[PDB]
């Protein structure tokens, strides 16, 4: 059994090597343990920051937007997550603009 | 573009 902090550190190793799948495995494990109420010094916002980017790199845009929204619920002022949200909202508005014109 | 932790 590994602490949430261990899982998070491992996910950062994966991320720094652009191993975005393993980043997702480790970060999701960390998030699960915190959600069950493990006492830990890592904060969910930073976990979600890495996780949202990793999921974006995998091409899973819906999931990346969801995670970005989860991050912003916890930290509404997060500058990059706000940036990423605006980007995802733009892409979605274009797709909906397309469906309305076709 | 989206920006992740640097
Ligand atoms: Mg995946």
Author numbering:
A (entry chain A): 144 to 245
B (entry chain E): 4 to 9
Report text from the authors:
Collagen prolyl 4‐hydroxylase (C‐P4H) catalyzes the 4‐hydroxylation of Y‐prolines of the XYG‐repeat of procollagen. The α‐subunit provides the N‐terminal dimerization domain, the middle peptide‐substrate–binding (PSB) domain, and the C‐terminal catalytic (CAT) domain. There are three isoforms of the α‐subunit, complexed with a β‐subunit that is protein disulfide isomerase, forming C‐P4H I‐III.
An extended mode of binding of proline‐rich peptides (PPII, polyproline type‐II, conformation) to the PSB‐I domain has previously been reported for the PPG‐PPG‐PPG and P9 peptides. The latter mode of binding has previously been reported for structures of the PSB‐II domain complexed with these PxGP‐peptides. Calorimetric binding studies show that the affinities of these peptides are lower for PSB‐I than for PSB‐II, with, respectively, K D values of about 70 μM for PSB‐I and 20 μM for PSB‐II.
